[PDB]
Amino acid sequence: FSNKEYISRLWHTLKYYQDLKNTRMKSITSTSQKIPSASIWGNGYSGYGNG
Amino acid sequence: ELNENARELEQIKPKIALQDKEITSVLSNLHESNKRYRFFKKISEDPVKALNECIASTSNALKVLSGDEGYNEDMVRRANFYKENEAMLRENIEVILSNGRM
Amino acid sequence: YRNFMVNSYRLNPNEYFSVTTARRNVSGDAAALFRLHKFLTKWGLINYQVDSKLLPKNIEPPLTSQYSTRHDAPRGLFPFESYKPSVQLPDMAKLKKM
Amino acid sequence: ALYDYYALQLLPLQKAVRGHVLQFEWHQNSLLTNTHPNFLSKIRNINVQ
Amino acid sequence: MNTSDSESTLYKYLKESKRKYDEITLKKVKILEQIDENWSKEDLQKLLKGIQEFGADWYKVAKNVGNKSPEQCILRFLQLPIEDKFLYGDGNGLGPLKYAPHLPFSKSENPVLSTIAFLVGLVNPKTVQSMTQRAIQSAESIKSQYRSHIFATNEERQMNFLTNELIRL
Amino acid sequence: PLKKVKILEQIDENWSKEDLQKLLKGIQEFGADWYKVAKNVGNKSPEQCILRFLQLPIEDKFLYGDGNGLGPLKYAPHLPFSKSENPVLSTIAFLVGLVNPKTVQSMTQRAIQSAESIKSQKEEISDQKPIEHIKEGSEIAISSLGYRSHIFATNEERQMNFLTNELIRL
Amino acid sequence: PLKIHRTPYLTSLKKIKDEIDDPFTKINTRGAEDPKVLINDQLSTISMILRNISFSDNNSRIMSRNFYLKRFISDLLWLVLIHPENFTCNRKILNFKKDLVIVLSNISHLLEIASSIDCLLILILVISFGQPKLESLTFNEFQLQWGKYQTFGVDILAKLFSLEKPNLNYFKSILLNNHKDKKLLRRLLNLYNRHNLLNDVVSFLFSAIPLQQVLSQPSLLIDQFSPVISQSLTSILVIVQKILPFNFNK
Amino acid sequence: GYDINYISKIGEKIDSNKPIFLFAPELGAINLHALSMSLQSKNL
Amino acid sequence: NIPSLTSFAEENNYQYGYTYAQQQLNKQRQDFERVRLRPEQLSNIIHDESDTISFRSNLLKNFISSNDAFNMLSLTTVPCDRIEKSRLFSEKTIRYLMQKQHEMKT
């Protein structure tokens, strides 16, 4: 709960979100290469009515 | 005479600029001293409510700068929170259950 | 009228439930039945799955998957915390007393 | 106390759903103007047109 | 932590502490009392036994309970007062412990501010305001023995009037 | 039942009538310098003279002897049974040791004001709980903090007037 | 109405910078902790969307003929000027004026002003950009090293004066002088402190023509500010020729 | 008690890489009719 | 170009459905109002002072400015009788008002 642990918590939180952004970029470049990959959020709709 | 007055204007201008530098540097100190005067007066008016607004806006000033978010942990841990917020839970439980995520 | 239209669509959802069959099967003027049918199909609820398509296949990256959650992940939200037990011997005596 | 123990058995799973449902309720509060308050949208200065 | 243990850290440490000083010198949670008219005691018992049977599958849980929608089961599972009788307060205040994961206080950095944060919960603000205003008025009664509080000397009042005169001129 | 006489004669633990007389002489003569007051008493600290002037005990454990009115103070760590550090009482003594003790006598009726007013005040502070001494001392400390904040506010207002005159001259 | 909140641009900037740089600030109290800030952050999203949509050739004429949008504009412009006490922050009140003028800059070439109260609040909103003084011209000149936001108002006033139908009739009856707004207009006009409105509008339109700046130092500044100068001169010519010709006393 | 310049320096990157909402390239096929019917849904 | 006011009318323009002069005027209309109403995709996106204001830097500066001003209040163990007052005039403002008051009789 001191300073040297409160910054080591923030290093073990930023390094998670950097890998999460790498996943987010790879799942964008996959669909831009016409490969239907899933994202961080779910797939939005289906063929039902909305596209 | 026009060029004489132009040379006099270009002579008188940097002494005006060096004064404007100190005018702005004193105005910034006036604003900084106004902040500390307000902080020292709101404490001296009520030293228990200002000493609760000074703490509640310091830990909240750390939560935003750290990057964390969410509810207060010690508020949502009790049972009267889910009894005063009975309205939004019946909405959200049906929304999560009907979408199939519960 | 509304329960008739909704019950009649949901027997075979692949078929476009037209206005003319609803007009031919319940008694009423064509304007109000047309307006109710267009309001109903405006909000989904009828003719929402006439021409349905199949999502082919999802090549899933890691952390975008079911059961892709770890105890090591940061709880940004989910405000409940897990706290570090402080094992100090005067604090051990304080915990024994309290 | 057998059913106290039943209530003392499934309490933190209830808190887990109380956290995820609250997290999704916080997700409902997404407005994109509570977040970055500078979202510069679109401007255009005075044209000759 | 077992005091009956003669070989734990607690026994030796506390004996050495008191020896060093003399050398130098139950509250059970009654969960079935939530029997508010929409629910009942048998309904709460079947709810708890069903959640212990099937973990978080609420359709099977509402099936085991019967006569109630799954949303009411999830809501009554949320609204159970399980841990409230082990927390501190009923609803004065918890103080800085109310702001649990973010504590910007240091004994070395702010020794006074942390003790004041712990102390402001106990006191009444009205008597504090009364005593500090009495201190202010007593200081004014001592100092007396327009902005004349700052401009106390006759010199500085004439200097300020000179400033206003030169501005107007 | 004996905690009452314990705090009543723990306030008056090792202070005789002569130490009280030298203390009151040093308090009424000298202003806001407790070191010379402690030297006027001789065999005591300035903090102990402040806490006897406020009619408070020491060692911080005769106040809140258990651990319910004390909210988070039960959950404070300590050195057990030895090495007595007193964060509450030294905080109160440090805050009252800045604020001109004659106006502290003007601030509360509880404080010692004269050698003829010790017995009546000692009688009227009797039959109080150990939480009451914490409450009154913390009230005096926070009020002294507010008074010091008012003095700092007036000095900052003087500073703003000085900056205004500098602006006008510029 | 109790007080027409005519705060200028620069005092609004100073109020924003003195509210952000406050120790006990509530500018980031979040969304889920307060419902009033949730309503305000929905309305700010609505205004950012509506100022973002209006940069298309088809949307600018569809948004022009939309009774719902005209009622919403005449509905917000009342609330941001007459009773801004409900908006939480003081940056949201400036940002509503900063995108209402942008969304009215793209629409106004086809806008037909509905009511006279809206035609007065348009004038007060456009006037509220710029710096006044402490009769004569009551507007010090706005030097464009600060921000071009007042140049959007002199185009709203240049395009909304081009119809002698309802626009110029409402502007005439406001500047020179269906049963409750007769009481509302006569309450708003004497709450605005005869003919202060006309000389305020003309003095503000004589501002944003940078005479001092282009005549101090020679072709670049006029080549950059020719449209704002042209539309300001068009608006002043309209006001001079078609409004000023008797109840004057000065 | 902390060195909050370094804490804020790291927390800026944490706020930048935090998954708040979708970006422009990952929105998918934006359906205007779905948005226009969800705005009239009077949900939250 | 600078097309018309008649080209902006709803009759000559498309609507939600469900000639040659019109299709000639709508060329000039969409070629005029897309070079006029298009946003600036470059810099000068600051627009003012109160858009590039940073909440994080101001929050950090206020966190420092509260902490040191509170350490100025409590931890400074100078008594109230010993806090010496500052001068209400400077060493230069006291010279200028001796000079101008000397030159005020002209």
mmCIF file of N, CA, C and O in Angstrom, chain A:
data_model
loop_
_atom_site.group_PDB
_atom_site.id
_atom_site.type_symbol
_atom_site.label_atom_id
_atom_site.label_comp_id
_atom_site.label_asym_id
_atom_site.label_seq_id
_atom_site.Cartn_x
_atom_site.Cartn_y
_atom_site.Cartn_z
ATOM 1 N N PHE A 1 0.829 -1.197 0.000
ATOM 2 C CA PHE A 1 0.000 0.000 0.000
ATOM 3 C C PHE A 1 0.866 1.250 0.000
ATOM 4 O O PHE A 1 0.362 2.369 -0.029
ATOM 5 N N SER A 2 2.178 1.051 0.022
ATOM 6 C CA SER A 2 3.122 2.158 -0.006
ATOM 7 C C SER A 2 3.306 2.637 -1.444
ATOM 8 O O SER A 2 2.566 2.254 -2.353
ATOM 9 N N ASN A 3 4.309 3.487 -1.668
ATOM 10 C CA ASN A 3 4.529 4.040 -3.001
ATOM 11 C C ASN A 3 5.129 3.005 -3.943
ATOM 12 O O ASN A 3 4.717 2.899 -5.106
ATOM 13 N N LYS A 4 6.089 2.220 -3.450
ATOM 14 C CA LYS A 4 6.789 1.242 -4.275
ATOM 15 C C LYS A 4 5.908 0.073 -4.687
ATOM 16 O O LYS A 4 6.261 -0.647 -5.625
ATOM 17 N N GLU A 5 4.778 -0.135 -4.015
ATOM 18 C CA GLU A 5 3.794 -1.098 -4.483
ATOM 19 C C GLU A 5 2.717 -0.448 -5.332
ATOM 20 O O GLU A 5 2.202 -1.083 -6.260
ATOM 21 N N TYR A 6 2.384 0.813 -5.053
ATOM 22 C CA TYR A 6 1.337 1.479 -5.814
ATOM 23 C C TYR A 6 1.800 1.837 -7.218
ATOM 24 O O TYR A 6 0.969 1.965 -8.120
ATOM 25 N N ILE A 7 3.107 1.990 -7.435
ATOM 26 C CA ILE A 7 3.562 2.179 -8.809
ATOM 27 C C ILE A 7 3.772 0.839 -9.515
ATOM 28 O O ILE A 7 3.537 0.735 -10.729
ATOM 29 N N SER A 8 4.156 -0.208 -8.779
ATOM 30 C CA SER A 8 4.268 -1.533 -9.377
ATOM 31 C C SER A 8 2.909 -2.111 -9.742
ATOM 32 O O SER A 8 2.834 -2.976 -10.619
ATOM 33 N N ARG A 9 1.842 -1.668 -9.078
ATOM 34 C CA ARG A 9 0.502 -2.022 -9.530
ATOM 35 C C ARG A 9 0.182 -1.349 -10.858
ATOM 36 O O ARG A 9 -0.392 -1.974 -11.755
ATOM 37 N N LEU A 10 0.564 -0.080 -11.010
ATOM 38 C CA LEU A 10 0.318 0.651 -12.245
ATOM 39 C C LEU A 10 1.180 0.173 -13.402
ATOM 40 O O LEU A 10 0.787 0.359 -14.558
ATOM 41 N N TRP A 11 2.335 -0.433 -13.137
ATOM 42 C CA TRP A 11 3.084 -1.078 -14.206
ATOM 43 C C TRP A 11 2.489 -2.412 -14.615
ATOM 44 O O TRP A 11 2.606 -2.799 -15.781
ATOM 45 N N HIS A 12 1.843 -3.118 -13.691
ATOM 46 C CA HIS A 12 1.153 -4.361 -14.000
ATOM 47 C C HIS A 12 -0.304 -4.131 -14.373
ATOM 48 O O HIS A 12 -1.123 -5.049 -14.254
ATOM 49 N N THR A 13 -0.635 -2.929 -14.794
ATOM 50 C CA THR A 13 -1.917 -2.518 -15.346
ATOM 51 C C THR A 13 -1.762 -1.873 -16.714
ATOM 52 O O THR A 13 -2.561 -2.146 -17.613
ATOM 53 N N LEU A 14 -0.727 -1.053 -16.905
ATOM 54 C CA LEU A 14 -0.461 -0.467 -18.214
ATOM 55 C C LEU A 14 0.010 -1.519 -19.207
ATOM 56 O O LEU A 14 -0.374 -1.488 -20.385
ATOM 57 N N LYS A 15 0.842 -2.459 -18.751
ATOM 58 C CA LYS A 15 1.325 -3.526 -19.620
ATOM 59 C C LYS A 15 0.219 -4.491 -20.019
ATOM 60 O O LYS A 15 0.350 -5.168 -21.042
ATOM 61 N N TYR A 16 -0.858 -4.572 -19.239
ATOM 62 C CA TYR A 16 -2.031 -5.320 -19.673
ATOM 63 C C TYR A 16 -2.730 -4.610 -20.824
ATOM 64 O O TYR A 16 -3.056 -5.226 -21.845
ATOM 65 N N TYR A 17 -2.972 -3.307 -20.672
ATOM 66 C CA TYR A 17 -3.718 -2.564 -21.678
ATOM 67 C C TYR A 17 -2.923 -2.341 -22.953
ATOM 68 O O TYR A 17 -3.528 -2.160 -24.010
ATOM 69 N N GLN A 18 -1.592 -2.379 -22.895
ATOM 70 C CA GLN A 18 -0.820 -2.330 -24.132
ATOM 71 C C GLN A 18 -0.979 -3.603 -24.954
ATOM 72 O O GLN A 18 -1.128 -3.526 -26.181
ATOM 73 N N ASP A 19 -0.991 -4.767 -24.304
ATOM 74 C CA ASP A 19 -1.291 -6.014 -24.997
ATOM 75 C C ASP A 19 -2.736 -6.048 -25.477
ATOM 76 O O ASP A 19 -3.029 -6.606 -26.543
ATOM 77 N N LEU A 20 -3.646 -5.454 -24.697
ATOM 78 C CA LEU A 20 -5.037 -5.335 -25.122
ATOM 79 C C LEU A 20 -5.173 -4.463 -26.364
ATOM 80 O O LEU A 20 -5.966 -4.779 -27.256
ATOM 81 N N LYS A 21 -4.402 -3.377 -26.453
ATOM 82 C CA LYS A 21 -4.415 -2.559 -27.657
ATOM 83 C C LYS A 21 -3.752 -3.263 -28.832
ATOM 84 O O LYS A 21 -4.163 -3.040 -29.975
ATOM 85 N N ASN A 22 -2.746 -4.107 -28.579
ATOM 86 C CA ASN A 22 -2.187 -4.933 -29.651
ATOM 87 C C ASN A 22 -3.217 -5.913 -30.203
ATOM 88 O O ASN A 22 -3.322 -6.077 -31.426
ATOM 89 N N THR A 23 -3.988 -6.552 -29.318
ATOM 90 C CA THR A 23 -5.109 -7.397 -29.727
ATOM 91 C C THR A 23 -6.172 -6.611 -30.494
ATOM 92 O O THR A 23 -6.677 -7.094 -31.516
ATOM 93 N N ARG A 24 -6.486 -5.398 -30.032
ATOM 94 C CA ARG A 24 -7.461 -4.545 -30.704
ATOM 95 C C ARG A 24 -6.998 -4.135 -32.099
ATOM 96 O O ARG A 24 -7.811 -4.090 -33.025
ATOM 97 N N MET A 25 -5.709 -3.855 -32.273
ATOM 98 C CA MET A 25 -5.189 -3.544 -33.599
ATOM 99 C C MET A 25 -5.140 -4.760 -34.511
ATOM 100 O O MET A 25 -5.415 -4.631 -35.713
ATOM 101 N N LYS A 26 -4.802 -5.934 -33.973
ATOM 102 C CA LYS A 26 -4.760 -7.135 -34.799
ATOM 103 C C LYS A 26 -6.154 -7.564 -35.239
ATOM 104 O O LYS A 26 -6.334 -8.006 -36.379
ATOM 105 N N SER A 27 -7.158 -7.400 -34.378
ATOM 106 C CA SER A 27 -8.529 -7.706 -34.766
ATOM 107 C C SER A 27 -9.140 -6.659 -35.687
ATOM 108 O O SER A 27 -10.219 -6.898 -36.236
ATOM 109 N N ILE A 28 -8.492 -5.507 -35.860
ATOM 110 C CA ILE A 28 -8.911 -4.552 -36.880
ATOM 111 C C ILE A 28 -8.262 -4.887 -38.214
ATOM 112 O O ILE A 28 -8.927 -4.919 -39.259
ATOM 113 N N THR A 29 -6.954 -5.171 -38.191
ATOM 114 C CA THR A 29 -6.243 -5.544 -39.412
ATOM 115 C C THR A 29 -6.690 -6.890 -39.964
ATOM 116 O O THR A 29 -6.504 -7.143 -41.157
ATOM 117 N N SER A 30 -7.258 -7.758 -39.125
ATOM 118 C CA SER A 30 -7.827 -9.000 -39.629
ATOM 119 C C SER A 30 -9.074 -8.745 -40.462
ATOM 120 O O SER A 30 -9.218 -9.304 -41.555
ATOM 121 N N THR A 31 -9.987 -7.906 -39.968
ATOM 122 C CA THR A 31 -11.206 -7.615 -40.716
ATOM 123 C C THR A 31 -10.941 -6.704 -41.904
ATOM 124 O O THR A 31 -11.715 -6.714 -42.864
ATOM 125 N N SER A 32 -9.865 -5.917 -41.861
ATOM 126 C CA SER A 32 -9.492 -5.130 -43.028
ATOM 127 C C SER A 32 -8.865 -5.978 -44.124
ATOM 128 O O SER A 32 -8.821 -5.542 -45.278
ATOM 129 N N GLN A 33 -8.379 -7.174 -43.790
ATOM 130 C CA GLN A 33 -7.939 -8.151 -44.776
ATOM 131 C C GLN A 33 -9.029 -9.158 -45.120
ATOM 132 O O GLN A 33 -8.708 -10.260 -45.583
ATOM 133 N N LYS A 34 -10.296 -8.798 -44.875
ATOM 134 C CA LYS A 34 -11.483 -9.596 -45.208
ATOM 135 C C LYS A 34 -11.468 -10.960 -44.521
ATOM 136 O O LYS A 34 -11.817 -11.981 -45.116
ATOM 137 N N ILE A 35 -11.057 -10.976 -43.260
ATOM 138 C CA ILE A 35 -11.104 -12.160 -42.412
ATOM 139 C C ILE A 35 -11.956 -11.818 -41.196
ATOM 140 O O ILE A 35 -11.587 -10.942 -40.411
ATOM 141 N N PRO A 36 -13.091 -12.479 -40.987
ATOM 142 C CA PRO A 36 -14.024 -12.072 -39.911
ATOM 143 C C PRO A 36 -13.611 -12.504 -38.503
ATOM 144 O O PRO A 36 -14.030 -13.523 -37.962
ATOM 145 N N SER A 37 -12.765 -11.693 -37.877
ATOM 146 C CA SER A 37 -12.322 -11.949 -36.516
ATOM 147 C C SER A 37 -13.212 -11.231 -35.511
ATOM 148 O O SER A 37 -13.859 -10.229 -35.827
ATOM 149 N N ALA A 38 -13.237 -11.754 -34.289
ATOM 150 C CA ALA A 38 -13.981 -11.125 -33.212
ATOM 151 C C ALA A 38 -13.147 -10.026 -32.566
ATOM 152 O O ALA A 38 -11.916 -10.031 -32.634
ATOM 153 N N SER A 39 -13.831 -9.081 -31.932
ATOM 154 C CA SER A 39 -13.187 -7.926 -31.336
ATOM 155 C C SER A 39 -13.242 -8.018 -29.815
ATOM 156 O O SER A 39 -13.666 -9.026 -29.246
ATOM 157 N N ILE A 40 -12.789 -6.946 -29.156
ATOM 158 C CA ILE A 40 -12.912 -6.835 -27.704
ATOM 159 C C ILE A 40 -14.378 -6.814 -27.307
ATOM 160 O O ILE A 40 -14.818 -7.569 -26.433
ATOM 161 N N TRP A 41 -15.152 -5.944 -27.942
ATOM 162 C CA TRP A 41 -16.596 -6.008 -27.887
ATOM 163 C C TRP A 41 -17.079 -7.190 -28.721
ATOM 164 O O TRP A 41 -16.357 -7.723 -29.567
ATOM 165 N N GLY A 42 -18.317 -7.598 -28.483
ATOM 166 C CA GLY A 42 -18.878 -8.702 -29.231
ATOM 167 C C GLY A 42 -19.180 -8.322 -30.667
ATOM 168 O O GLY A 42 -19.105 -7.162 -31.071
ATOM 169 N N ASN A 43 -19.494 -9.337 -31.464
ATOM 170 C CA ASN A 43 -20.052 -9.080 -32.779
ATOM 171 C C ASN A 43 -21.431 -8.454 -32.614
ATOM 172 O O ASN A 43 -22.242 -8.903 -31.801
ATOM 173 N N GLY A 44 -21.677 -7.382 -33.362
ATOM 174 C CA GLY A 44 -22.841 -6.562 -33.092
ATOM 175 C C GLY A 44 -24.167 -7.196 -33.441
ATOM 176 O O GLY A 44 -24.880 -7.660 -32.552
ATOM 177 N N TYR A 45 -24.480 -7.310 -34.724
ATOM 178 C CA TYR A 45 -25.762 -7.858 -35.136
ATOM 179 C C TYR A 45 -25.511 -9.187 -35.842
ATOM 180 O O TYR A 45 -24.389 -9.701 -35.904
ATOM 181 N N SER A 46 -26.579 -9.763 -36.372
ATOM 182 C CA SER A 46 -26.494 -10.915 -37.253
ATOM 183 C C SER A 46 -27.201 -10.537 -38.543
ATOM 184 O O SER A 46 -27.450 -9.355 -38.784
ATOM 185 N N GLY A 47 -27.505 -11.513 -39.390
ATOM 186 C CA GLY A 47 -28.254 -11.224 -40.599
ATOM 187 C C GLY A 47 -29.708 -10.840 -40.394
ATOM 188 O O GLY A 47 -30.378 -10.491 -41.370
ATOM 189 N N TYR A 48 -30.208 -10.884 -39.163
ATOM 190 C CA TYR A 48 -31.605 -10.607 -38.854
ATOM 191 C C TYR A 48 -31.888 -9.120 -39.007
ATOM 192 O O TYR A 48 -31.599 -8.329 -38.108
ATOM 193 N N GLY A 49 -32.460 -8.731 -40.145
ATOM 194 C CA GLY A 49 -33.017 -7.399 -40.302
ATOM 195 C C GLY A 49 -31.984 -6.300 -40.417
ATOM 196 O O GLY A 49 -31.814 -5.699 -41.478
ATOM 197 N N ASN A 50 -31.299 -6.020 -39.317
ATOM 198 C CA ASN A 50 -30.109 -5.202 -39.393
ATOM 199 C C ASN A 50 -28.981 -6.025 -39.999
ATOM 200 O O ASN A 50 -28.989 -7.254 -39.952
ATOM 201 N N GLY A 51 -28.021 -5.337 -40.600
ATOM 202 C CA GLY A 51 -26.991 -6.009 -41.358
ATOM 203 C C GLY A 51 -25.963 -6.707 -40.489
ATOM 204 O O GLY A 51 -25.969 -6.623 -39.262
#
